[PDB]
Ligand binder design. Structure first.
Ligand SMILES: CC(/C=C/C(=O)NO)=C\[C@@H](C)C(=O)c1ccc(N(C)C)cc1
Ligand SMILES: [K+]
Ligand SMILES: [K+]
Ligand SMILES: [Zn+2]
Ligand SMILES: [Zn+2]
Length: 383
């Protein structure tokens, strides 16, 4: 197996996105997330195995492949850039939130550093885009983007849920611009639904979006992504919401996620037959996250095994991008497990006794609804 065919993407640029209040306590999407992962990668000796990349900033045009021109100018530029903008744009920017902590924000959760946040978000997006292009051209086999802020909640003209630009959706669009007719699968295992991603590709049959998320009948952030949302127009059938219902008791964990993969993720993905796979790889379904931030128990090995299964797709062209997840030990274990798998380490499903347990009933039920709905569109889902 070829050396240096797995890319890692990281840069200290992305650390500077911090509220001016200097308190990681009230801001869970903090710089420590990526830095703790980065060093773990070095320590366990994986970094040296990978083509390491710095990333770069997304251009305003790359941004506009997903987001509106006004969103891009709001979050993609600074006062007062050396940017050549016409006075009409400059004036629009003159026409236009205080946080409890005294920092500036877009909303309560979503903080804005007036010096650094625009650079860090553009850098997250450009880095996933670049790590991906390498895989698409096939100079690399797969890879992992250690990026923040996250992306999957940002829609055409909305920043929310810690996110400003949808780095994954942007990479997806860029890829497709450069290889005509290519088919892209986005798998989003962050515990939250990637509303911006679903919306971006909702009427687009060239992209298959599969989200697994805690849903609980419309009652978990962001409240979107019910099982019956299958896509529209041309793209009807190409949006798959594995919407987990029923809450926190019983325990949602490895047997459920493994079962989701066996029954839904993998068979639909093989039927679709993607040219490349992007992963919105949040780790907030990991053990370590309290009720309001997750409440699930997926383990690092399971994230590892899920990565390994997706490598059987697309000739192996797999790109992960960090989304959510804030327990440092939990996200470091998960990331390690994922990077090992990317390199071609194999997880032994027999090694775990807890993986002999049947999925819980809320899980089986949730999957029944996915199968019921998607039978109309997918052969593997039929009868
Ligand atoms: C935005 C988001 C997750 C995003 C994500 O993970 N990307 O998908 C979670 C919000 C709604 C939330 O529930 C919350 C809970 C506790 C808290 N503290 C008091 C630490 C701050 C925020
Ligand atoms: K998700
Ligand atoms: K689609
Ligand atoms: Zn603050
Ligand atoms: Zn999340």
């Amino acid at each position: 197996t070829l050396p240096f065919t797995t890319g890692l993407i990281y840069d200290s640029v992305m650390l500077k996105h911090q509220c001016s209040c200097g308190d990681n306590s009230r801001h869970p999407e903090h710089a420590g997330r990526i830095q703790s992962i980065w060093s773990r990668l070095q320590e366990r000796g994986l970094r040296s195995q990978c083509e390491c990349l710095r990333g770069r900033k997304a251009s305003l045009e790359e941004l506009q492949s997903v987001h509106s021109e006004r969103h891009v100018l709001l979050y993609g530029t600074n006062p007062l850039s050396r940017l050549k903008l016409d006075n009409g744009k400059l004036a629009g920017l003159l026409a236009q939130v205080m946080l409890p902590c005294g920092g500036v924000g877009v909303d309560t959760d979503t903080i804005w550093n007036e010096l650094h946040s625009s650079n860090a978000a553009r850098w997250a997006a450009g880095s996933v885009t670049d790590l991906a292009f390498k895989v698409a051209s096939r100079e690399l086999k797969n890879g992992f983007a250690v990026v923040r802020p996250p992306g999957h909640h940002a829609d055409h003209s909305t920043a929310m849920g810690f996110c400003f630009f949808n780095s994954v959706a942007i990479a997806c669009r860029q890829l497709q611009q450069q290889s005509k007719a290519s088919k892209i699968l986005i798998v989003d295992w962050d515990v939250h639904h990637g509303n911006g991603t679903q919306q971006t590709f909702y009427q687009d049959p060239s992209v298959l979006y599969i989200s697994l998320h805690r849903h609980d009948d419309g009652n978990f952030f962001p409240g979107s992504g019910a099982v019956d949302e299958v896509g529209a127009g041309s793209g009807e059938g190409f949006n798959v919401n594995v919407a987990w219902a029923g809450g926190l008791d019983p325990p949602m964990g490895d047997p459920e996620y493994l079962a989701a993969f066996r029954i839904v993720v993998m068979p639909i993905a093989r039927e679709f037959s993607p040219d490349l796979v992007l992963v919105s790889a949040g780790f907030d379904a990991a053990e370590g996250h309290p009720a309001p931030l997750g409440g699930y128990h997926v383990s690092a090995k399971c994230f590892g095994y899920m990565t390994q299964q997706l490598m059987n797709l697309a000739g192996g062209a797999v790109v992960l991008a960090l989304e959510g997840g804030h327990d440092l030990t939990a996200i470091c274990d998960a990331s390690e497990a994922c990077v090992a798998a990317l390199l071609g380490n194999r997880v032994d499903p027999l090694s775990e006794e807890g993986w002999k347990q049947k999925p819980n009933l809320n899980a089986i039920r949730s999957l029944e609804a996915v199968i019921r709905v998607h039978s109309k569109y997918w052969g593997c889902m039929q009868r």
